[PDB]
């Protein structure tokens, strides 16, 4: 794809719901149609139908799959083989060789564990990879924790530190850096202080998970 | 050992003082007797007859040895060869080599240099690590400072930097962390916060340098 | 050179103006003669010449060059080879390989892109390293930002990650740590805060921009 010449306002969208998947791409630069955490265990199956039936601009879409290792997986790729689309989001990204058993496809390696984090150079520098993002929940939930903000909404430590890794990771490596979600949809002044921080320290993306963030992400990464 | 079992509250306790080893153990979860900086040089024979002749509860106590290539360290094997204890707190720890020269014994490697810090991942993923561990006064001190904490008492960024990873590496590699001392004993509300913090980023024990920290740590890891 | 011998005090004179060389070299510890961008193209055959014909003490002066594989660079070891200097400092520095190609000179390598941040220990680790520098202002420009600090005037958090790094780095390899610029000069509170945290933390050297920085650098440095 060309995904440096789409927009930094990225979306995602649960694979269950095609009904909105029009409205998602008018809104978004790009979606992320989602086959993980966006849909339930039961509705899994209904998604996988939904994204070979209702299709978007494959110049446009990435699709969020399942882990590696993982049956889910197996079947999401299964699916995908009957779409047009070219580049998938790998959940919980560990290591290179999950990377690699993705060619020939493209992959934006999500980032939200300890090994991730280690091992981000790795899995940066792995040919498949177009893009490189983080997220903050699951990092903490997988390393035993309970918060990843503290009382007053900055990022502990922990998620600020795998944030500027996985930027340097892939800028090293000439990818896509996205920035993580916020996750307090209402919270719009929240989102503006980091996308500005994002754009200004050299985010091509801030994902977003609700059509509302589209608007504020596109303004902060303006000049 | 089953350290992760046992609770978060861990307490150092000079290895030349048994007449308080049974009040530490009564205290804390587990109990870290200690060989290195909590015994001067010319008591470090006093404290190994103790370790011999003064036992705990081997599933609830661990002995901090002296740092890698030592003539005291030598010494410490000796002694605890005529103990049950398994575990062993490596200071200083700087290579995956120092841990791995410790076997068959399982090792708490305590990273408090800028090699250690480095080499975190590799040391957190030799085969005898059971745990990681950070600490900011040898950290300053051994790369040429006066202070690990600024003006306002939060610590400098290299320690924080440190921090983080040290959490990252133990919990990439399925180890226990554990978050550096206070060394502030009478600043309860610093223990409150750091605490609170570590548990909510998923540190398994903040360890502790006296016996009335350890409630605080307790409590701060709750839920 | 006896780098750690010299005070903490280094100040870039640009080496097209060899009429300010000497009240450099009178105000600060050591001078860095810089080829690179205090000088603009046109000038640099200019400077070469003045780095020949105007000398320093060479136990008091490192030689900034131009970048690995530039034509500059080539320009740069040419004219070098006319002069006493034994010490240089190689801006954007992105591997051990482009340090090793500059032996058997001493290098100060500048790191300031992603790509020189993740390498780091690799950089600190090459045998001609004697130093590692860090640089926020073409580290953001080089990721595709546009402000290494926010409105309160602290640095960004991927700013902070790369000082610790490159901190870190230096100091596991027996390296001069060196802080970067403080580009306000006029600003001496900011530029006191600063040296004094680098100065806590273990920084040998903050580097200067202006003559005036070096008392207040001096001063942070004292105890």
């Not at 927009?7 to 409205?23: I, Q, R, S, T, Y």
């Not at 060789?97 to 940066?124: F, N």
């Not at 500005?196 to 990464?221: E, L, M, N, W």
């Amino acid at each position: 794809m060309n995904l440096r010449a789409a927009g930094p306002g990225w979306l995602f969208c649960p694979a269950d719901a095609p009904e909105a998947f029009a409205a998602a791409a008018a809104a978004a630069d790009v979606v992320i149609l989602d086959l993980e955490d966006g849909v339930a265990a039961a509705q899994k199956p209904a998604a996988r139908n939904a994204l070979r039936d209702t299709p978007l601009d494959p110049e446009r879409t990435v699709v969020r799959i399942n882990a590696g290792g993982t049956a889910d997986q197996a079947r999401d790729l299964e699916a995908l083989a009957g779409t047009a689309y070219t580049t998938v989001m790998l959940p919980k990204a560990e290591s290179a060789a999950q990377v690699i058993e993705l060619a020939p496809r493209d992959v934006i390696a999500l980032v939200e564990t300890a090994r991730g984090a280690v091992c981000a150079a790795e899995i940066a520098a792995a040919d498949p990879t177009v893009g490189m993002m983080w997220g903050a929940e699951d990092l903490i939930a997988t390393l035993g924790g309970s918060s990843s903000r503290r009382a007053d909404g900055a990022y502990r430590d922990v998620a600020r530190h795998v944030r500027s890794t996985i930027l340097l990771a892939a800028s090293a490596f000439g990818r896509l850096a996205l920035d993580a979600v916020h996750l307090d949809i209402l919270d719009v002044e929240g989102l503006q202080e980091e996308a500005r921080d994002a754009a200004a320290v050299g985010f091509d993306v801030t994902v977003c998970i609700h059509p509302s963030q589209i608007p504020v992400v596109r303004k902060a990464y303006a000049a």
